[PDB]
Design a protein around this ligand. Structure first.
Ligand SMILES: C[S@@H](CCCN)C[C@H]1O[C@@H](n2cnc3c(N)ncnc32)[C@H](O)[C@@H]1O
Ligand SMILES: C[S@@H](CCCN)C[C@H]1O[C@@H](n2cnc3c(N)ncnc32)[C@H](O)[C@@H]1O
Lengths: 285, 294
């Protein structure tokens, strides 16, 4: 409520944001969705949470959306067809659609209410959802990839909630076999790759099963997000083709017309993301 | 501003008007220390043993160290600076009474002596009592630890005394206030030898960007040839990161690329965060902050 504290806890730590006004707080068909304006004496703006876990804020949203969208597309030689699983807020889709190469993007999120509330309360995040290059569907991403042809996509971006709720299977090897299949030979996959502080064991598990399922290479890109647990998150950037080094940008964004509208990502930051703290560096070898 | 009332209903809550609208919280298993010293409010507590954080120290309600992530800031301060220097033999730490940066500095076989001057002797005594893995080098024969204001210490120190000066302070509100000022950086530039390096506690790009820009400008104006900010990942600092301004007295020095890589040192494998790839990556800043570095 106004003057209280949205508190995110799931051990012995919580990140909290002061509330100015609650805009929406209700059950969807799948999740508990909350949207509030945080204290205007702070920089956060409007905040969206799902099942108690912060998803986007006005002040820092650009980080994760730019890192997912551009690290993957600038690693691809000519990304024309893209799939986003999850991503119902539209942020990754806004970034992907900056690229002049993209002809079509399909976005599939299980919760149609996330798209609706993002259109109502996060116009700068959701502008993309109406673009005629995108087909936006309500549905489970695991079912979607199981109905999708081999060799459909240049890039697949898995922008999901954590393993504990409706995204559970999207962190498993069966799903990843299907993502490898629906990618074209030169395809790239990236995901919501979780934390090196909280989820190191899961990142090592997934990096190994993704490689073993048939991806030629898998590297974790670390990013700074103040409102995600412990202040960061990462993405596993995976290449179907051997001999690809996703840690150096193949097509640097500085050669693109929208490079100077980005707030976080550029080529120095792309290369820097793959340097990991010594305790974690074995992820990237 | 803050003291004992941040410990409320089972938790320490990092509420501060230096970061409005937010607060990191850690749960409290047992308060170990909570009292005003001669200069600051010192709080030490054991966090939830079900969590990883261990013991936690705060000053004037600002989290300073936890057991679990202290290695990050101490390794980055200590090794980014020394690894940027051709032969760092004489080092000064202003602040740093927990000993963490000193522990890292003393890994270096080049160091003949390090002086440490912290205003608050209570911080050193409680670090020895409650953070032994952090404070393990305070009594080293290669260190001299003194209790006093760093502003006075630097003004008394002769020209051309130190190869590296590390300014490991609390925030600008309390006793560290003048350590974020031009007058003080004048003295640091003077006490450095010609090929000196300094670095500091350079605050947050998400909360203090305007302060970082101001320090960067006046450090260059005092006469330092180059100033670059290195960003690092610290979960228990506000917004989950902090930085350091790494400054070269001499021109032609690229502090962003290690001069003496740590990998050619026998203790490289002992570090938990820092290495040369992390050193080079730390100077890459989000586009909105990149003007701090050029
Ligand atoms: C909000 S987005 C994360 C915020 C940063 N863009 C995570 C989305 O993942 C969706 N999600 C969770 N599970 C699934 C499945 N199984 N399929 C598709 N999308 C899903 C969920 O409905 C969110 O809108
Ligand atoms: C705890 S240390 C930072 C935590 C990571 N090592 C910050 C130290 O700055 C000291 N400090 C603050 N002001 C000054 C002055 N003016 N002089 C010296 N040391 C100072 C203060 O007593 C802390 O122990």
């Amino acid at each position: 409520i106004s003057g209280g504290w949205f508190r995110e806890e799931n051990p012995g730590q919580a990140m909290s944001l002061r509330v100015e006004k609650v805009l929406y707080d209700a059950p969807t068909k799948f999740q508990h969705l909350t949207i509030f304006e945080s204290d205007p004496k702070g920089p956060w703006g409007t905040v969206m949470a799902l099942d108690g876990c912060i998803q986007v804020t006005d002040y820092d949203e650009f980080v994760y959306h730019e890192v997912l969208g551009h690290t993957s597309l600038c690693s691809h030689p000519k990304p024309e067809r893209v799939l986003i699983i999850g991503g119902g807020d539209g942020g990754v889709l806004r970034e992907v659609l900056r690229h002049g190469t993209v002809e079509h993007c399909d976005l599939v999120d299980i919760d149609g209410e996330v798209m609706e509330q993002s259109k109502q309360h996060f116009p700068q995040i959701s502008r993309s959802l109406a673009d005629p290059r995108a087909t936006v569907r309500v549905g489970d991403g695991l079912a979607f990839v199981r109905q999708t042809p081999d060799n459909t996509y240049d890039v697949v971006i898995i922008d999901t909630t954590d393993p504990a709720g409706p995204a559970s299977k999207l962190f498993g090897e069966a799903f990843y076999k299907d993502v490898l299949r629906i990618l074209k030979p030169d395809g790239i996959c990236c995901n919501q790759g979780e934390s090196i502080w909280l989820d190191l064991e899961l990142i090592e598990k997934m990096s190994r099963f993704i490689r073993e399922t048939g991806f030629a290479s898998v590297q974790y890109a670390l990013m700074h997000v103040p409102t995600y647990p412990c202040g960061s998150i990462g993405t596993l950037v995976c290449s179907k083709k051997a001999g690809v080094d996703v840690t150096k940008p193949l097509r640097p964004v500085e050669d693109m017309p929208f490079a100077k509208d980005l707030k976080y990502y550029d080529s120095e930051m792309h290369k820097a993301s793959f340097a990991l703290p010594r305790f974690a560096r074995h992820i990237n070898n």
